[PDB]
Amino acid sequence: IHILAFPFPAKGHINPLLHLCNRLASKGFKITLITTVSTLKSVKTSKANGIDIESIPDGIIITVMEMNMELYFKQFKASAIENTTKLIQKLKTKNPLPKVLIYDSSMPWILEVAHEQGLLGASFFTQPCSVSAIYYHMLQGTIKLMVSLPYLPLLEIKDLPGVQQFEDNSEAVAELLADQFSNIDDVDYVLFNTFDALEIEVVNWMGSKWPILTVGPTAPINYLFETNTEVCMKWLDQREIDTVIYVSFGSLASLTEEQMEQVSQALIRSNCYFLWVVREEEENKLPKDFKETTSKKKGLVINWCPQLDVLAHKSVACFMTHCGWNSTLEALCSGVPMICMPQWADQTTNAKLIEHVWKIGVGVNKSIVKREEIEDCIRQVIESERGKELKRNAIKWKELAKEAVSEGGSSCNNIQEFSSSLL
Numbered sequence: 001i002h003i004l005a006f007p008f009p010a011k012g013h014i015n016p017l018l019h020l021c022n023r024l025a026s027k028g029f030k031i032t033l034i035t036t037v038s039t040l041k042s043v044k045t046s047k048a049n050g051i052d053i054e055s056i057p058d059g060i061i062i063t064v065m066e067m068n069m070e071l072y073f074k075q076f077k078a079s080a081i082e083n084t085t086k087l088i089q090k091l092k093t094k095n096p097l098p099k100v101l102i103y104d105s106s107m108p109w110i111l112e113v114a115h116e117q118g119l120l121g122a123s124f125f126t127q128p129c130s131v132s133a134i135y136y137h138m139l140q141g142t143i144k145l146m147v148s149l150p151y152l153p154l155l156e157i158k159d160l161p162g163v164q165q166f167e168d169n170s171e172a173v174a175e176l177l178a179d180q181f182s183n184i185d186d187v188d189y190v191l192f193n194t195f196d197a198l199e200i201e202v203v204n205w206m207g208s209k210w211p212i213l214t215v216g217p218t219a220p221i222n223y224l225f226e227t228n229t230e231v232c233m234k235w236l237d238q239r240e241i242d243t244v245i246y247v248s249f250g251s252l253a254s255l256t257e258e259q260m261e262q263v264s265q266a267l268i269r270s271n272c273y274f275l276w277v278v279r280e281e282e283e284n285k286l287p288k289d290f291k292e293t294t295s296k297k298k299g300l301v302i303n304w305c306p307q308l309d310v311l312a313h314k315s316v317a318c319f320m321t322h323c324g325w326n327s328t329l330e331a332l333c334s335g336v337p338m339i340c341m342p343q344w345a346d347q348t349t350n351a352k353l354i355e356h357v358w359k360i361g362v363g364v365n366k367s368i369v370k371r372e373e374i375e376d377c378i379r380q381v382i383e384s385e386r387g388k389e390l391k392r393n394a395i396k397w398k399e400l401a402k403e404a405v406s407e408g409g410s411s412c413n414n415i416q417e418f419s420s421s422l423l
């Protein structure tokens, strides 16, 4: 059985779908991963995973979409429709023939391409059910971007997904999030990268509307991009248990030079070891001599790391994160408590769930997040009794996540059900 997979062209969408693809390949499915030219330029390792990679034109890549998201997302959609159609037509000249297309839930219009080509369509949601619920209510018109929503904790305005941050892209971004539910009744399979025990009531409510399959964490060939694995893991192996602050703001968020200074000073004025992912295009905003000298005694500043392996390392005491869903889920499944510094979109909501529902992190308070506030949060997690509580809570969630992906677990059962439906 041949499965096609089409993530949105950004690492937080590619990676969870790649991990699901690796699970399905291990069950005997053939996988073809559809990437844009722009994504493929960053791909450095792919031989080992045995997945075919097929590229399509960019169609307009994230840096160009930011210049005008309303126009360029629509251009990206039109090219993706045309070019995935042409690619599927070519794949139909080869055995085994494609049978199903798993596509990012942010591109619901790919369902039409799947069905026009005689394929089953599976929408893959890369955000938890709790946050996806908000997008559904936005589409229904129940909410527009104190707030009560069914089966969610009471929210402050700042806990709703952040679209105002995008300024002239705000309305375009809000419409694309709500559009994820625009054809959900016509989808053949609805997949969520979450596990039931993490959000029992909202999953149960969602399941009362559509048959959904919770298949997360899809994370366990694990990386496509340069991760600097050797340098990162040898440095971590030099650290004692529970001593390293891991710091990352993900693949897209960028902090101003002013904000980077406060982070840098806060890490230095703490006396903790730290591994800080500062992407290559963001390095020039670090303080003058930070990467080359002042970070050398206690820090490793790196442009990308093997995040799953880092979070699994016993040296890591806590994760200062922007609260993207992959980073949130990977930390929870690793048992790593968090310092929440959300930037925009669903990160604000994830931070509220981390702090107040799952209780595995603390949130920073904006004044810019000043260095004293970051230092206080580090102290809360590394030293305080509250931090020991957050760690115990994280280990409890790690155990439930391990339950979910092991035989008899909810996510294992759902991946088996999806696989058997295809057979």
Ligand SMILES: C[C@]12CC[C@H](O)C[C@H]1CC[C@@H]1[C@@H]2CC[C@]2(C)[C@@H](c3ccc(=O)oc3)CC[C@]12O
Pocket: 008, 010, 062, 063, 065, 066, 069, 105, 106, 166, 169, 173, 176, 177, 180, 252, 253, 345
């Ligand atoms: C506007 C945006 C700001 C951050 C970066 O500079 C890139 C800009 C353009 C792209 C835009 C991001 C915002 C998050 C996305 C909607 C996010 C997304 C996409 C689909 C979806 O359903 O949910 C989130 C991925 C990246 C994103 O599409």
Ligand SMILES: O=c1ccn([C@@H]2O[C@H](COP(=O)(O)OP(=O)(O)O)[C@@H](O)[C@H]2O)c(=O)[nH]1
Pocket: 010, 011, 012, 013, 015, 016, 248, 249, 250, 251, 252, 253, 277, 303, 304, 305, 306, 307, 308, 323, 324, 325, 326, 327, 328, 330
């Ligand atoms: O140094 C890094 C930083 C991040 N990641 C991965 O990049 C993704 C980040 O996704 P997330 O949802 O947390 O945030 P986004 O980048 O979409 O804002 C996740 O798969 C992380 O594991 C990584 O492999 N190495």
